[PDB]
Amino acid sequence: NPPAASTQEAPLLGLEAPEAIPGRYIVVYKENADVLPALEALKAALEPGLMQPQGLQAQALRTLGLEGARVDKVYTAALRGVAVEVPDQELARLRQDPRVAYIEADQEVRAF
């Protein structure tokens, strides 16, 4: 009678690469997930010069399950996703979201 265990676990990619940045991740959403308006609100909450109501950011953090998580970048156009810095337990919770396609460890890039 207690509900079955969740069967959701997004792939977690890139942790083994030598250029992986510890504790930092790119969460990528599936294209069929209705995450766009929440992401747009989170991006707007970071936009210079723009006044935004508190409720939009608070709602977006709830919709995406990012309360308490340190969201650094928000993607809406080149990608649907966020860049976050979270501890292991929070990472495990984000992987249980069925809207998440995969999560990649952030990686260092260099000028060529």
């Binding site: 993607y75 990686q107 890039v109 060529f112």
Partner: protein
């Protein structure tokens, strides 16, 4: 209608791309200038006050500091921007240059900062538009997808092959087929010894000992090497073509540059590399 112009003397990379064969003639010739075209330089930023860009800096985006001005504090992005569109050192001397700062003052950044820059350009670019990515790293599905989505939005993306003397198909975004992946050559038409190679390249351009702008003063210059220096020659040539054909799709821009490229002149081009060197009659 415009009239053709002659720059003489010209730095060797520009000198090479307006002709089929060696020897160099000390001259760079062009008709179009890239006027009305928008080049988004995804790099360390641009020195906004450089004389090479006077009056032609457009709005940008700083992924390193929210709301920052995207000024270059390293030099790499200014050098790259100078090859695209500097009055003296540039292919497209009338292009608008937009600084998209995704690397810090040491030339280092992250996939997350690069993707943020690509996200900003995809959302806010003005057509006709081209992105220059003189940077890269390990294989990344997220970074490859962001590049593909910029291309699908109608923005040509030109990327450096990398400097490992290895197959470019191992790295992002060099392995993205729909991007124009650029290898580097020397002034005597050899593939530069460091240039990545292989089936993921689209063509070669000058990349060894390239002279361009630098960030330390409004008139500073530097001479450096890398596939990061070859890439902006191609971005500049794309901007010239886009002035002639402002509604061209990325596929059409690539087809035109590959049709016009000089075939079979790159020595030691590497296993499975297309033997094509940038040529501009624009």
């Amino acid at each position: 209608p415009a009239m053709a112009a002659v720059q003489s003397p010209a730095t060797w990379g520009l000198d090479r791309i307006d002709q089929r064969t060696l020897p160099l003639d000390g001259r760079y010739t062009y008709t179009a200038t890239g006027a009305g075209v928008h080049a988004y330089v995804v790099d360390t930023g641009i020195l906004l006050s450089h004389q090479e860009f006077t009056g032609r800096i457009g709005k940008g985006y700083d992924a390193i500091t929210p709301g920052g001005s995207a000024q270059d504090c390293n030099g790499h992005g200014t050098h790259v921007a100078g090859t695209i569109g500097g009055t003296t050192y540039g292919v497209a001397k009338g292009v608008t240059l937009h600084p998209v700062r995704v690397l810090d003052c040491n030339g280092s950044g992250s996939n997350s900062s690069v993707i943020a820059g690509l996200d900003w350009v995809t959302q806010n670019h003005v057509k006709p538009a081209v992105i220059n990515m003189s940077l890269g790293g390990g294989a990344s599905t997220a970074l490859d997808t962001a590049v593909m989505n910029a291309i699908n939005a109608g923005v040509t993306v030109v990327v450096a092959a990398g400097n490992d003397n290895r197959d470019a198909c191992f790295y992002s975004p060099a392995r993205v087929t729909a991007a124009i992946t650029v290898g580097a050559t020397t002034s005597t038409d050899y593939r530069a010894s460091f240039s990545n190679y292989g089936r993921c390249l689209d063509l070669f351009a000058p990349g060894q000992s390239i002279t361009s702008a630098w960030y330390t003063s409004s008139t500073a210059t530097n001479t450096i090497s890398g596939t990061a220096m070859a890439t902006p020659h191609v971005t500049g040539a794309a901007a010239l073509y886009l002035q002639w054909y402002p509604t061209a799709t990325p596929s059409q821009v690539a087809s035109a540059l590959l049709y016009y490229a000089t075939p079979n002149v790159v020595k030691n081009a590497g296993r499975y590399s297309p033997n094509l060197l940038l040529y501009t009659p624009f």
